[PDB]
Amino acid sequence: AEIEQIKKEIAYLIKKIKEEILEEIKKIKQEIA
């Protein structure tokens, strides 16, 4: 059960992480547009 809990918690964190940084990049694009 726990290893399956782990797999779930990681894919999710990785998704937020990816998006958290992509936003920093999106603001830069809008700015220097």
Joined together, the tokens standing for residue 10 give: 């990681």
| Closer residue to Ni ion in complex, CB, 9/23 | 23
Q: Binding to a copy of itself by residue 30, rule CB under 8 A? A: no
Three state DSSP letters for 1-33: CHHHHHHHHHHHHHHHHHHHHHHHHHHHHHHCC
Q: Binding to a copy of itself by residue 23, rule CB under 8 A? A: no
* 30: partner contacted, choices a copy of itself, Ni ion, Cl ion, none (Cβ within 5-8 A by kind): none
> Rounded to whole angstroms, how far apart are CA atoms 29 and 21?
13
| Closer residue to Cl ion in complex, CB, 9/19 | 19
Binding residues for Cl ion (CB under 5 A): 19
